[PDB]
Structures are given as structure tokens and as C-alpha cells.
CSV table of all heavy atoms in Angstrom, one decimal:
chain,number,residue,atom,x,y,z
A,179,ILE,N,-2.8,8.0,-6.7
A,179,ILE,CA,-1.5,7.4,-7.0
A,179,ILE,C,-0.4,8.1,-6.3
A,179,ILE,O,0.4,7.5,-5.6
A,179,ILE,CB,-1.3,7.4,-8.5
A,179,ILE,CG1,-2.5,6.9,-9.3
A,179,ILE,CG2,-0.1,6.4,-8.8
A,179,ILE,CD1,-2.5,7.2,-10.7
A,180,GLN,N,-0.3,9.5,-6.4
A,180,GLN,CA,0.7,10.2,-5.8
A,180,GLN,C,0.5,10.4,-4.3
A,180,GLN,O,1.4,10.8,-3.6
A,180,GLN,CB,0.8,11.6,-6.4
A,180,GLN,CG,1.1,11.6,-7.9
A,180,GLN,CD,0.9,13.0,-8.5
A,180,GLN,OE1,0.6,14.0,-7.9
A,180,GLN,NE2,1.1,13.1,-9.8
A,181,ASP,N,-0.7,10.0,-3.8
A,181,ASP,CA,-1.0,10.0,-2.4
A,181,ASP,C,-0.8,8.6,-1.8
A,181,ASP,O,-0.5,8.5,-0.6
A,181,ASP,CB,-2.4,10.5,-2.1
A,181,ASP,CG,-2.4,12.0,-2.2
A,181,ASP,OD1,-1.4,12.7,-1.9
A,181,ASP,OD2,-3.5,12.5,-2.5
A,182,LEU,N,-1.0,7.5,-2.6
A,182,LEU,CA,-0.9,6.2,-2.1
A,182,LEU,C,0.5,5.8,-1.8
A,182,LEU,O,0.8,5.1,-0.8
A,182,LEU,CB,-1.6,5.2,-3.0
A,182,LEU,CG,-2.0,3.8,-2.5
A,182,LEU,CD1,-0.9,2.8,-2.6
A,182,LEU,CD2,-2.6,3.9,-1.2
A,183,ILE,N,1.5,6.3,-2.6
A,183,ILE,CA,2.9,6.0,-2.4
A,183,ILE,C,3.5,6.8,-1.3
A,183,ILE,O,4.2,6.3,-0.4
A,183,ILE,CB,3.6,6.1,-3.7
A,183,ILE,CG1,3.1,5.1,-4.8
A,183,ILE,CG2,5.1,6.0,-3.5
A,183,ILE,CD1,3.6,5.4,-6.2
A,184,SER,N,3.1,8.1,-1.2
A,184,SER,CA,3.8,9.1,-0.4
A,184,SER,C,3.4,8.9,1.1
A,184,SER,O,3.7,9.8,1.9
A,184,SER,CB,3.5,10.5,-0.9
A,184,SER,OG,4.1,11.4,0.0
A,185,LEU,N,2.7,7.9,1.4
A,185,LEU,CA,2.3,7.7,2.8
A,185,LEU,C,2.9,6.4,3.4
A,185,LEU,O,2.6,6.1,4.6
A,185,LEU,CB,0.8,7.6,2.9
A,185,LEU,CG,0.1,9.0,2.6
A,185,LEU,CD1,-1.4,8.9,2.6
A,185,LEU,CD2,0.6,10.0,3.6
A,186,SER,N,3.8,5.8,2.7
A,186,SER,CA,4.1,4.4,2.9
A,186,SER,C,5.0,4.1,4.2
A,186,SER,O,5.5,3.0,4.3
A,186,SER,CB,4.9,3.8,1.7
A,186,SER,OG,4.1,3.8,0.5
A,187,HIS,N,5.1,5.1,5.0
A,187,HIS,CA,5.7,4.8,6.3
A,187,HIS,C,4.6,4.8,7.4
A,187,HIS,O,4.9,5.1,8.6
A,187,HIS,CB,6.8,5.9,6.6
A,187,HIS,CG,6.3,7.3,6.7
A,187,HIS,ND1,5.9,7.9,7.8
A,187,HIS,CD2,6.3,8.2,5.7
A,187,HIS,CE1,5.5,9.1,7.6
A,187,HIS,NE2,5.8,9.4,6.3
A,188,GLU,N,3.4,4.4,7.0
A,188,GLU,CA,2.3,4.5,8.0
A,188,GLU,C,1.7,3.2,8.2
A,188,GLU,O,1.4,2.5,7.2
A,188,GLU,CB,1.3,5.5,7.5
A,188,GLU,CG,1.8,6.9,7.6
A,188,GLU,CD,2.2,7.2,9.1
A,188,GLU,OE1,1.4,6.9,10.0
A,188,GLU,OE2,3.3,7.7,9.3
A,189,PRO,N,1.3,2.8,9.5
A,189,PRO,CA,0.9,1.5,9.8
A,189,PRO,C,-0.5,1.1,9.2
A,189,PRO,O,-0.7,-0.1,9.0
A,189,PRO,CB,0.8,1.5,11.3
A,189,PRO,CG,1.8,2.5,11.7
A,189,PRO,CD,1.6,3.6,10.7
A,190,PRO,N,-1.4,2.0,8.8
A,190,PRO,CA,-2.5,1.5,8.0
A,190,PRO,C,-2.3,1.5,6.6
A,190,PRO,O,-3.1,0.8,5.9
A,190,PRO,CB,-3.7,2.5,8.4
A,190,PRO,CG,-3.3,3.0,9.6
A,190,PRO,CD,-1.8,3.2,9.6
A,191,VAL,N,-1.4,2.3,6.0
A,191,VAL,CA,-1.2,2.1,4.6
A,191,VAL,C,0.0,1.2,4.2
A,191,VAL,O,0.2,0.9,3.1
A,191,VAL,CB,-1.1,3.5,3.9
A,191,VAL,CG1,0.2,4.1,4.1
A,191,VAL,CG2,-1.5,3.5,2.4
A,192,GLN,N,0.8,0.8,5.3
A,192,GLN,CA,1.8,-0.2,5.0
A,192,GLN,C,1.1,-1.6,4.9
A,192,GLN,O,1.6,-2.4,4.2
A,192,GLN,CB,2.8,-0.2,6.2
A,192,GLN,CG,4.0,-1.0,5.9
A,192,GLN,CD,5.0,-0.9,7.0
A,192,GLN,OE1,4.8,-0.2,8.0
A,192,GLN,NE2,6.2,-1.5,6.9
A,193,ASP,N,-0.1,-1.7,5.5
A,193,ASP,CA,-0.8,-3.0,5.4
A,193,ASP,C,-1.7,-3.1,4.1
A,193,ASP,O,-2.0,-4.2,3.7
A,193,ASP,CB,-1.6,-3.3,6.6
A,193,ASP,CG,-0.7,-3.6,7.8
A,193,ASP,OD1,0.4,-4.2,7.6
A,193,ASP,OD2,-1.1,-3.3,9.0
A,194,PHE,N,-2.0,-2.0,3.5
A,194,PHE,CA,-2.8,-2.0,2.3
A,194,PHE,C,-2.0,-2.5,1.1
A,194,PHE,O,-2.6,-3.1,0.2
A,194,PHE,CB,-3.3,-0.6,2.0
A,194,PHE,CG,-3.9,-0.5,0.7
A,194,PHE,CD1,-5.1,-1.1,0.4
A,194,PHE,CD2,-3.3,0.3,-0.4
A,194,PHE,CE1,-5.7,-1.0,-0.9
A,194,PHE,CE2,-3.9,0.4,-1.6
A,194,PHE,CZ,-5.1,-0.3,-1.9
A,195,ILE,N,-0.7,-2.4,1.2
A,195,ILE,CA,0.1,-2.7,0.0
A,195,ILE,C,0.5,-4.2,0.0
A,195,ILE,O,0.6,-4.8,-1.1
A,195,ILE,CB,1.3,-1.8,-0.1
A,195,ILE,CG1,0.8,-0.3,0.0
A,195,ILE,CG2,2.1,-1.9,-1.3
A,195,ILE,CD1,1.9,0.7,0.2
A,196,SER,N,0.7,-4.8,1.1
A,196,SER,CA,1.2,-6.1,1.2
A,196,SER,C,0.1,-7.1,0.8
A,196,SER,O,0.5,-8.2,0.2
A,196,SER,CB,1.6,-6.5,2.7
A,196,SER,OG,0.5,-6.4,3.5
A,197,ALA,N,-1.1,-6.8,0.9
A,197,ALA,CA,-2.2,-7.6,0.4
A,197,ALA,C,-2.3,-7.5,-1.1
A,197,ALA,O,-2.8,-8.5,-1.8
A,197,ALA,CB,-3.5,-7.2,1.0
A,198,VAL,N,-1.9,-6.4,-1.7
A,198,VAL,CA,-1.8,-6.2,-3.1
A,198,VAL,C,-0.7,-7.1,-3.7
A,198,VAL,O,-0.8,-7.7,-4.7
A,198,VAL,CB,-1.6,-4.7,-3.5
A,198,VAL,CG1,-1.4,-4.5,-4.9
A,198,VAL,CG2,-2.8,-3.9,-3.0
A,199,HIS,N,0.4,-7.2,-2.9
A,199,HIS,CA,1.4,-8.2,-3.2
A,199,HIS,C,0.9,-9.6,-3.1
A,199,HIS,O,1.4,-10.5,-3.8
A,199,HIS,CB,2.7,-8.0,-2.4
A,199,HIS,CG,3.2,-6.6,-2.4
A,199,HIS,ND1,3.6,-6.0,-3.6
A,199,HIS,CD2,3.5,-5.7,-1.4
A,199,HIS,CE1,4.0,-4.7,-3.3
A,199,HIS,NE2,4.0,-4.6,-2.0
A,200,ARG,N,0.0,-9.9,-2.2
A,200,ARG,CA,-0.6,-11.2,-2.1
A,200,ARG,C,-1.6,-11.5,-3.2
A,200,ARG,O,-1.7,-12.7,-3.6
A,200,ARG,CB,-1.4,-11.3,-0.8
A,200,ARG,CG,-0.6,-11.3,0.5
A,200,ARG,CD,-1.5,-11.4,1.7
A,200,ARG,NE,-0.8,-11.4,3.0
A,200,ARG,CZ,-1.4,-11.4,4.1
A,200,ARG,NH1,-2.8,-11.6,4.2
A,200,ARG,NH2,-0.7,-11.4,5.3
A,201,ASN,N,-2.3,-10.5,-3.8
A,201,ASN,CA,-3.3,-10.7,-4.7
A,201,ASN,C,-2.8,-10.7,-6.2
A,201,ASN,O,-1.9,-9.9,-6.5
A,201,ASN,CB,-4.4,-9.7,-4.6
A,201,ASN,CG,-5.2,-9.9,-3.3
A,201,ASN,OD1,-5.5,-11.0,-2.9
A,201,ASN,ND2,-5.5,-8.8,-2.6
A,202,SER,N,-3.3,-11.6,-7.0
A,202,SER,CA,-2.7,-11.8,-8.3
A,202,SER,C,-3.2,-10.6,-9.2
A,202,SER,O,-2.4,-10.0,-9.9
A,202,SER,CB,-3.2,-13.1,-8.9
A,202,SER,OG,-4.6,-13.2,-9.1
A,203,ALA,N,-4.5,-10.4,-9.3
A,203,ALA,CA,-5.0,-9.4,-10.2
A,203,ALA,C,-4.9,-8.0,-9.6
A,203,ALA,O,-4.9,-7.0,-10.4
A,203,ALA,CB,-6.5,-9.7,-10.6
A,204,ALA,N,-4.8,-7.9,-8.3
A,204,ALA,CA,-4.8,-6.5,-7.7
A,204,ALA,C,-3.4,-6.0,-7.8
A,204,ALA,O,-3.2,-4.7,-7.7
A,204,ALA,CB,-5.3,-6.6,-6.3
A,205,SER,N,-2.4,-6.8,-8.0
A,205,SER,CA,-1.0,-6.3,-8.1
A,205,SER,C,-0.8,-5.7,-9.5
A,205,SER,O,0.0,-4.8,-9.7
A,205,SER,CB,0.0,-7.4,-7.9
A,205,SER,OG,-0.1,-8.4,-8.9
């Protein structure tokens, strides 16, 4: 949790989060 947020200026973990915004139960 403390690692997933603190990387959010990175092109492979910037794309991990937008799909979570796409998914109903994963958000």
C-alpha cells in the first residue's frame, strides 16, 4: 500500500491505477 502510491509518477504504475478506476470491484 505504501509502495503502490509512492511510485505514481512512473509509466508502468501509472497504468496500473487507471484500470482500477475502470473496474467496479477492483476500485
Side-chain angles (χ1 to χ4, degrees):
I179 314 162
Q180 299 172 0
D181 284 331
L182 197 277
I183 294 171
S184 174
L185 294 175
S186 296
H187 60 90
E188 290 301 315
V191 79
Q192 191 175 3
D193 288 330
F194 170 67
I195 305 171
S196 66
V198 175
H199 307 303
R200 293 180 181 179
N201 290 320
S202 66
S205 65

